[PDB]
Write a protein that binds this ligand. Structure first.
Ligand SMILES: CCCc1cc(=O)[nH]c(N)n1
Length: 379
């Protein structure tokens, strides 16, 4: 049929602080909440006390704990930690019914990494080898899982909006998590989950750049990132185009920088004045592409605020980047995304749980005749 009921709704989170899954490590197993991250490729867990950790990995208590007698250091855009390598038996209570020996980094030192009141104490790097620390020699979690178990080389994510929730379906595709068709873009290279963007529209108006601008110096699908991050030039034209489309209301300058909340009486958010955003992505067929479309409900992240109800408050969740395009949680929150590693591709369908209104919905449409798409990549 297509129903993975044990794995539906296995993710949780706070807004702006990421999506996490419940995992266990060791013997006897220790329950820990682990961040689901397609932008990195290292499994790592808090193994010591910290001001923002409620619990941590007590490796001396694990009878199956192995020491790799080695060190590991991982930097991110947000934060960095260093830890002691080693292995232990790992399992996901609301995942596939398996236990696997895998690589673990026990975090001893970390800087601006563990978030206050996040409720997660580690991270699952789901991206490929080519970017693992200390190097490509370290086999990542999902590669271990497929080695030691019969589970298909494939996971899907449904990240829902709004504490948030979602579904990581390991080893398959759940039919209840989308509507309409799955459209596939090729993973251009197995390191990040790198895709190619061939065109951008705001309310159907072409942003009109050379397409290389959209993929400078890469475009990636990153569950571990909150915002839709765009290259400086692309960001500045989108904001200009979005400012124009929303011009019946003016907002403070700081709002467009992510520095300031905008607010409306409850239920009166004027979604319809804000534009739709379309990203055309390279297809499987030659000279073909499809487009995904998100709503202001995806790129205006809601913020609870400290004064009263009676106002619904939001943050602009599109930000500037220097490392390329990052299709983070604001993009992924409109779609069921299928990381089809077995067939070097990434699937997009309309999410069955996405936030929208009566009059507009997130969309995934195709095909479109689009030429010289290979040219859009960086080299
Ligand atoms: C805990 C956050 C880890 C992280 C940080 C970051 O900057 N990017 C990604 N993909 N992941």
């Amino acid at each position: 049929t297509g129903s993975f009921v044990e794995m539906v709704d296995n993710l949780r989170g706070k807004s702006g602080q990421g999506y996490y899954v419940e995992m266990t490590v060791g013997s006897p197993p220790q329950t820990l909440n682990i961040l689901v991250d397609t932008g990195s490729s290292n499994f790592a867990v808090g193994a010591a006390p910290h001001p923002f950790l409620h619990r941590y990995y007590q490796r001396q208590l694990s009878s199956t704990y192995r020491d790799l007698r080695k060190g590991v250091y991982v930097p991110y855009t947000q934060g960095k930690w260093e830890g002691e390598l080693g292995t232990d038996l790992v399992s996901i209570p609301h995942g596939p019914n398996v236990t696997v020996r895998a690589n673990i980094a026990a975090i001893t030192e970390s800087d601006k990494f563990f978030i206050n009141g996040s409720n997660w104490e580690g991270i699952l790097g789901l991206a490929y080898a080519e970017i693992a620390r200390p190097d490509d020699s370290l086999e990542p979690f999902f590669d271990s899982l497929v080695k030691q178990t019969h589970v298909p080389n494939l996971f899907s994510l449904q990240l829902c909006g709004a504490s948030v929730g979602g579904s990581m379906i390991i080893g398959g595709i759940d039919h209840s998590l989308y509507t309409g068709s799955l459209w596939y873009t090729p993973i251009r290279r197995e390191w990040y989950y790198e895709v190619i963007i061939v065109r951008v529209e705001i309310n159907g108006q072409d942003l009109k750049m050379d397409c290389k601008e959209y993929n400078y110096d890469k475009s990636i699908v990153d569950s571990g990132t909150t915002n839709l991050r765009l290259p400086k030039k692309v960001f500045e034209a989108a904001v200009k185009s979005i400012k124009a489309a929303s011009s019946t209301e003016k907002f403070p300058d700081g709002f467009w920088l992510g520095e300031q909340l905008v607010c409306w009486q409850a239920g009166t958010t004027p979604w319809n004045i804000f534009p739709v955003i379309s990203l055309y992505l390279m297809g499987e067929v030659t000279n073909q592409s499809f487009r995904i479309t998100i709503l202001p409900q995806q790129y205006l992240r809601p913020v609870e605020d400290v004064a009263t109800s009676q106002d619904d408050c939001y943050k602009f969740a599109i930000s500037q980047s220097s490392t390329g395009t990052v299709m983070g949680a604001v993009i992924m929150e409109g779609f069921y995304v299928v990381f089809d590693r077995a067939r070097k591709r990434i699937g997009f369908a309309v999410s069955a749980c996405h936030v929208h209104d009566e009059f507009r919905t997130a969309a995934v449409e195709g095909p479109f005749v689009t030429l010289d798409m290979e040219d859009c990549g960086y080299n």
